[PDB]
Amino acid sequence: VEKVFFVTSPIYYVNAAPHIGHVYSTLITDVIGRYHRVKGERVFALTGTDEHGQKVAEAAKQKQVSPYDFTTAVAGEFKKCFEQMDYSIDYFIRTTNEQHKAVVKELWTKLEQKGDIYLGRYEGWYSISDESFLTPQNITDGVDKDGNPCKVSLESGHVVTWVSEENYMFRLSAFRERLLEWYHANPGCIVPEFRRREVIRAVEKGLPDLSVSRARATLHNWAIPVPGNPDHCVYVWLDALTNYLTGSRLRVDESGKEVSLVDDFNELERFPADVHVIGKDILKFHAIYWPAFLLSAGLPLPKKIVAHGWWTKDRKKISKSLGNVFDPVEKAEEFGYDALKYFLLRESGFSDDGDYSDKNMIARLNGELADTLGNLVMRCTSAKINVNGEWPSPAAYTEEDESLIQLIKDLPGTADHYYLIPDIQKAIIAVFDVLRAINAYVTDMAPWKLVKTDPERLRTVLYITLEGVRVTTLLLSPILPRKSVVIFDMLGVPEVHRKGIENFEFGAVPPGTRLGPAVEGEVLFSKRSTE
Numbered sequence: 001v002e003k004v005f006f007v008t009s010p011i012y013y014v015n016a017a018p019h020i021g022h023v024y025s026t027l028i029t030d031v032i033g034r035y036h037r038v039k040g041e042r043v044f045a046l047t048g049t050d051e052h053g054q055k056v057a058e059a060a061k062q063k064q065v066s067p068y069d070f071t072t073a074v075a076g077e078f079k080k081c082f083e084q085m086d087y088s089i090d091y092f093i094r095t096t097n098e099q100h101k102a103v104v105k106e107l108w109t110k111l112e113q114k115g116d117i118y119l120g121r122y123e124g125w126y127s128i129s130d131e132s133f134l135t136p137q138n139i140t141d142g143v144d145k146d147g148n149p150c151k152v153s154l155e156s157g158h159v160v161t162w163v164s165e166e167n168y169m170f171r172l173s174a175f176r177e178r179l180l181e182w183y184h185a186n187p188g189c190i191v192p193e194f195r196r197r198e199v200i201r202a203v204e205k206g207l208p209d210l211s212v213s214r215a216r217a218t219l220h221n222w223a224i225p226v227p228g229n230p231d232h233c234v235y236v237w238l239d240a241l242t243n244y245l246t247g248s249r250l251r252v253d254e255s256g257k258e259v260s261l262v263d264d265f266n267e268l269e270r271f272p273a274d275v276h277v278i279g280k281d282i283l284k285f286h287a288i289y290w291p292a293f294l295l296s297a298g299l300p301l302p303k304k305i306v307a308h309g310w311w312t313k314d315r316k317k318i319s320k321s322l323g324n325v326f327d328p329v330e331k332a333e334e335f336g337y338d339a340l341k342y343f344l345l346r347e348s349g350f351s352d353d354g355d356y357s358d359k360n361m362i363a364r365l366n367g368e369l370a371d372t373l374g375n376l377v378m379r380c381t382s383a384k385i386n387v388n389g390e391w392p393s394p395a396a397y398t399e400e401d402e403s404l405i406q407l408i409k410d411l412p413g414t415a416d417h418y419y420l421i422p423d424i425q426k427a428i429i430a431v432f433d434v435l436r437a438i439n440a441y442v443t444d445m446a447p448w449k450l451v452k453t454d455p456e457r458l459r460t461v462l463y464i465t466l467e468g469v470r471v472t473t474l475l476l477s478p479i480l481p482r483k484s485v486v487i488f489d490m491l492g493v494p495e496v497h498r499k500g501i502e503n504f505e506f507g508a509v510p511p512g513t514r515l516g517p518a519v520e521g522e523v524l525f526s527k528r529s530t531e
């Protein structure tokens with residue numbers, strides 16, 4: 001099937017200003033989309049905001065302003081933040097969008113007509129902050145913001161409350177066996193593997209039915225009405241998950257503004273998502289509820305769900321009220337946007353709760369970006385080594401030459417597999433392993449000495465170095481989008497050779513190609529002092 005590669009981030013609650021968790025999730029989405037664009041594929045990358053529900057509505061009341069004005073303002077902050085981060089996201093969806101609401105009502109009606117929605121009751125615990133139903137096994141004792149005894153979620157530590165309401169119920173219990181068949185038939189569909197195992201164990205134990213409506217007063221009338229019953233509102237999570245279907249059906253003009261909702265997802269060739277990027281905190285919604293709704297509705301299921309961990313800073317909880325802030329834009333103005341992105345994607349794998357420190361940020365910037373990648377770009381482009389300012393024509397290759405050439409040739413196959421898992425950390429590590437080998441080769445060959453002693457030998461060494469730098473930079477371009485352009489300009493790599501799988505091949509840029517012009521004193525990544 002040739003189709004548009006469809007990658008998504010979660011749509012974020014607009015109860016508070018955007019922060020590092022949101023930036024991180026949308027970054028992963030952006031990187032995956034960018035890599036598929038360098039491969040020459042059609043891509044639709046989606047992000048946005050989750051704007052209905054009790055959580056958001058009560059955050060608006062706290063601030064003493066209307067939900068409409070509140071959500072519009074905070075969604076504006078998210079848009080601004082993501083523009084400042086310099087992503088290449090194709091659309092920003094808001095659940096208040098009138099076309100999204102039509103799609104939610106459509107899906108509801110499908111579920112209902114399929115016989116999978118009935119009027120029942122939920123009597124049980126609920127976390128307003130997570131908008132999540134919890135069993136007694138998933139709560140424990142704790143303290144509310146008055147320091148009085150209460151119950152809290154074991155998952156998140158937020159205050160839980162007991163709910164007893166006539167609700168419309170979705171027959172989730174009936175989808176157990178189909179969900180299990182799905183997980184087993186597609187053993188790569190949840191990443192990392194231990195989270196896949198977690199999902200399977202939970203579904204094995206049995207699934208209760210799920211409340212998909214609430215009484216309208218509980219939500220302060222800030223939600224989508226249930227079709228044919230204006231006393232009930234659609235569960236914010238059914239509403240929110242539907243953004244993925246809605247986005248797959250929106251024609252967007254070149255300004256990023258939605259102009260049209262198509263009738264059938266096949267028209268845009270996006271649905272279902274090839275990758276849903278999510279945090280570990282929202283796995284059950286995406287890996288259990290969502291596919292069950294899709295099965296009920298007769299819609300295709302997503303191919304992969306990738307669930308990452310949670311950031312700390314200086315080995316502590318990130319929080320402004322606690323006195324540990326981690327502002328991405330502040331760190332990006334200090335160290336660079338591409339470099340901050342590199343660090344966030346290099347420092348932690350999806351299976352870990354990563355940790356930022358200025359010390360370690362500087363160690364990676366200096367060690368990897370400046371000393372490994374940056375040093376090598378400067379060397380192979382300098383007037384001292386590359387006296388003709390061009391790609392030289394190589395002479396005969398030695399066995400050592402070819403050992404390096406083999407690593408460069410193998411790199412795209414390997415990086416590609418890692419990007420497709422997706423495991424961005426391993427793709428980056430694979431690229432830098434090759435950068436390190438190129439460096440060791442350059443040290444070994446000492447091209448500076450060759451400029452006088454063996455000009456013919458220098459041609460070979462310099463050519464291999466340039467081509468290694470080009471290939472590694474190409475595979476890093478999803479991670480370092482701005483810096484890869486600077487590097488390609490320095491190398492004088494023609495535009496046409498900066499994307500497409502044709503250019504993953506060793507030898508794509510011909511000898512005789514002229515380097516770009518030098519700028520006196522320019523440097524790609526500048527080292528920072530240990531502070």
Ligand code: MET
Pocket residue numbers: 009010011012013050240241242243282
């Ligand atoms: C359909 S993804 C919804 C995610 C939810 N709004 C959150 O911030 O956790």
